[PDB]
Design a protein around this ligand. Sequence first.
Ligand SMILES: [Cl-]
Ligand SMILES: [Cl-]
Ligand code: NA
Ligand code: NA
Lengths: 229, 225, 229, 225
Amino acid sequence: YNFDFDVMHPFMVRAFTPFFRPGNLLELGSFKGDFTSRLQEHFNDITCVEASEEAISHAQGRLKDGITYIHSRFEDAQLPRRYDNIVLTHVLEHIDDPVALLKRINDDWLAEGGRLFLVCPNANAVSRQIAVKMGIISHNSAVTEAEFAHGHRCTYALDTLERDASRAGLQVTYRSGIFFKALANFQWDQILQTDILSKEYLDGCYQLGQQYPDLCASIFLLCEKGINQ
Amino acid sequence: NFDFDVMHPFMVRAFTPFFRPGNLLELGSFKGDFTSRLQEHFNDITCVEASEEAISHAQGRLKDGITYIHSRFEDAQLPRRYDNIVLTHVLEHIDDPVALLKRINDDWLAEGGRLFLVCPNANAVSRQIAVKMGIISHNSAVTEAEFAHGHRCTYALDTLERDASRAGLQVTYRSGIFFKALANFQWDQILQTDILSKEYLDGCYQLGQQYPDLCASIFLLCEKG
Amino acid sequence: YNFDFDVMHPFMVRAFTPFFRPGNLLELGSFKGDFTSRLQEHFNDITCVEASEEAISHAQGRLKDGITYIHSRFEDAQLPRRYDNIVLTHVLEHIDDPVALLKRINDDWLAEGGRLFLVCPNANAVSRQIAVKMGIISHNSAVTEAEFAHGHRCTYALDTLERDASRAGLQVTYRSGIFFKALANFQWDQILQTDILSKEYLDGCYQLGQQYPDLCASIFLLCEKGINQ
Amino acid sequence: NFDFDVMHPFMVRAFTPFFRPGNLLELGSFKGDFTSRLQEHFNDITCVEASEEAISHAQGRLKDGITYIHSRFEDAQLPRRYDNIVLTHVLEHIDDPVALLKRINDDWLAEGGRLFLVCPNANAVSRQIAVKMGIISHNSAVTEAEFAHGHRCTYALDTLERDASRAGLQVTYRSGIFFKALANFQWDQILQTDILSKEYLDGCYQLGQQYPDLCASIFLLCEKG
Ligand SMILES: [Cl-]
Ligand SMILES: [Cl-]
Ligand code: NA
Ligand code: NA
């Protein structure tokens, strides 16, 4: 059990489902294709952009047909088309110039009526706030040493995430949160090996999280295209 | 009027990303004040309203493309099932709310259809301040004036989802509409002044989504169970 | 490990400590003396009112000197004195007429300058809200069957608790919450047998709970005497 | 003025149940506006203020029982240690806030003494609405105007407790003062009207305690580590 892959990925797909547009999907930062496989249950026409040849090859081997793979960094990517749905989940925090990426999404890649599904780890998640109170993390939006090593350049909260989307020219249509998270991953991974927490308890955390977006594991902005000339 | 001038447009904004293609049923359409806004999104709207006077008034002021059904909910015979059903600021008046919601689930929602269920929120900031002030006993109380207006309940997210769930609906999304720190009587006064802008109101709508429990109205997006 | 006795009792004493007045203390509903023993670290002159002869006898055996024991129901209790500190923790929810008890506290028992420490289980605790979303409990302020069996007649939240204090003539001076609680007791009691959660993590829950009173395990009103004639 | 007329009295209300018997030190007492309120609770108050003009003004308008110390914090030589230390709306101006807090911990607090640390809150409702409106980039930003006024930080509970902790203080209680949904410029306008009562303001103070993160100002009660 990995909390991110086994718990968060499915709830993210749940969170997105009511907002999906008919048509195609673009997955930015598809890596090894773990999230793509869930998206394939919803879309037959998926385009995947990933900078790592190794990751993109693994995906290619594992996933079913109907994926267009684009091996590129986002700033160099030349896409053949515009997209009805764009997924950017746990990628923006790794980008040196996040406004410039969101701006490409707005200006170059969103179809008319298209939607961006923008999801990042939340600074203000309960578990993270507890770690801040414990002094393990200096403050909520801090980037820790491990985090920086893993490539994080920011730790978004709803305030700074909407700022950057807004700065990029996107229209933010909906703000929400995914999964009320009171334990840290290291704790989840241990507890999930036990029968202490049920699947219903997890579903409850998802359900309650919608009522306290600011306290969830990940925060979620639904965005639409704004006119920029 | 805060409710018609501020709340109605934000309710439509909140629904817009969830609307399904197809038709729409408005339950409790009254004089058509909300229907007019919905007409910007749908050419095929069916309206159910028990007051003949109200429904007559709407018919007078709305554009073509409306099927009007003059009936109590318990008596209503609808000719189709619906991709979108709106029940906004109605359920808190209903003596047996779960029974109405169960008709929606079992009879009126199309497969794939969505119910837009919106009710005034007991935990709204302005109401909580009124409770702290001793004006209202507690958040989910029904005041004498509200009871006189026909309220039988003051929903919060907990009680509203309970009733939807008991009816057999699948509650898909929970949210709030408008971060509300002032009472209607105060808004109606301040709205005559230039102390608050439209951008302020927009800001309250945006912030509201981040604190659903504190909003003016709470919103459950539901699907057929 | 019992979450209530091992985790909540000590945090309750922490929560109270900054507000304690010099002088004596009255503990209403002292039962077997589990909480009294912690209070004895702070006060040498404690008066304990308890309706159960069995419980009050157990306390008597176990606790150190400096306790005045009063075996009475609250409505019949004739106390010799007024008190600088009154503790009513997890008792008010068991009372058929809670305003009438709080009114005795205001009118008969609080000394001038005296403080009431009023603590009840919170309807809106995170764990409880999750159980509501799971459909195990109908709504936050519901009283479940097990709860009713244990003697609960109400499940307070900050709104209804301040209402009743106010109705009784008390002045509510401070509102807070004790312990950010995302798991149910049955889960705590299992997890506490493991090394999954540390003492620092628990302290973090206490610390964060103060910032979200409405979501804590127990809610806490600090009250002072109001004039009633 | 919202800050002097509403905020100051609620700050005293918030401190009152935590006050220790003994003496009190007010750091950054300026013209004595807050000191006058504290004088209702303490006969032995020591005031530290760097502006000679300000401190002269206070001396003119305050009652006996005040020791005035005209000094920068870094230079201040205090004759005693203090049972109560007040540092309200000062720390956000200090270039090295942890260094000031460390002097408080190590040199000025009496054993058993309490520090009343209060700063304007980045996550205040009114500020969050301003951020959603695009007026301020984000909650903890410092605006040009605020920077011109000397702010170097916009604290929230997370950053304020971080700095107190780094100084070696023991953070004993965390709270908020005043649930604030309107900006000062809006309060100052609405306060001229009769749209909001004193009971409304009291209600905002009461509700604020239940949502510290959303208050006008945040309040840490600290003790010596
Ligand atoms: Cl159907
Ligand atoms: Cl000392
Ligand atoms: Na442009
Ligand atoms: Na009386």
